[PDB]
């Protein structure tokens, strides 16, 4: 038959993703947690991660998932940004709101 020959060890690590949310009123329907200064959401990571995802909201539609490490928002860099910074960013967005989250291709643990 055949034997183990191939190899090529591939590295695994969350990837960058971009989602588009719609704003027809007020703001979106998600929750953020972390931000420099306050406690992190995931381990020792001073990043802005999703704390909640309104089941029946605009985000849910976009395809946002709790735990997603926000990287950008409407172009704004939410990299290790303070709560305010993040919050503000969110506030700063029109109808269509683009949010760049970080996640690994597929479900992780659960």
UniProtKB/Swiss-Prot annotation:
Subcellular location: Cell membrane; Cell junction; Cell junction, Adherens junction; Cell projection, Lamellipodium
Annotated tissue distribution: Expressed in kidney, skeletal muscles, liver, lung, breast, intestine, placenta and skin mainly in epithelial cells (at protein level).
Recorded superkingdom: Eukaryota
Phosphoserine PTM sites in chain numbering: 54
Every PDZ domain range: 18-104
First and last residue of the signal peptide: none
Modification after translation: Ubiquitinated; targeted for UBE3A-dependent multiubiquitination in the presence of high-risk HPV E6 proteins and degraded.
Function: Scaffold protein involved in different aspects of polarized cell differentiation regulating epithelial and neuronal morphogenesis and T-cell polarization. Via its interaction with CRTAM, required for the late phase polarization of a subset of CD4+ T-cells, which in turn regulates TCR-mediated proliferation and IFNG and IL22 production. Plays a role in cell directional movement, cell orientation, cell sheet organization and Golgi complex polarization at the cell migration front. Promotes epithelial cell layer barrier function via maintaining cell-cell adhesion.
Reported disease: Neural tube defects: Congenital malformations of the central nervous system and adjacent structures related to defective neural tube closure during the first trimester of pregnancy. Failure of neural tube closure can occur at any level of the embryonic axis. Common NTD forms include anencephaly, myelomeningocele and spina bifida, which result from the failure of fusion in the cranial and spinal region of the neural tube. NTDs have a multifactorial etiology encompassing both genetic and environmental components.
Family: Belongs to the LAP (LRR and PDZ) protein family.
Oligomeric and partner information: Interacts with UBE3A. Interacts with PAK1 and PAK2. Interacts (via PDZ domains) with VANGL2. Interacts (via PDZ domains) with LPP and TRIP6; the interaction is direct. Interacts (via PDZ domains) with TJP2. Interacts (via PDZ domains) with APC; may mediate APC targeting to adherens junctions of epithelial cells. Interacts (via PDZ domains) with TSHR; regulates TSHR trafficking and function. Interacts with ARHGEF7 and GIT1; interacts directly with ARHGEF7. Interacts with CTNNB1. Interacts with MAPK12. Interacts (via PDZ domains 1 and 3) with MCC. Interacts with DLG5. (Microbial infection) Interacts (via fourth PDZ domain) with tick-borne encephalitis virus RNA-directed RNA polymerase NS5; this interaction targets viral NS5 to the cell membrane periphery and nucleus and prevents STAT1 phosphorylation, and thus, the activation of the JAK-STAT signaling pathway. Interacts with HPV E6. Interacts with influenza A virus protein NS1; the interaction results in the translocation of SCRIB from the cell membrane to perinuclear puncta.
Name of the protein this chain belongs to: Protein scribble homolog
Biological source species: Homo sapiens
Gene: SCRIB
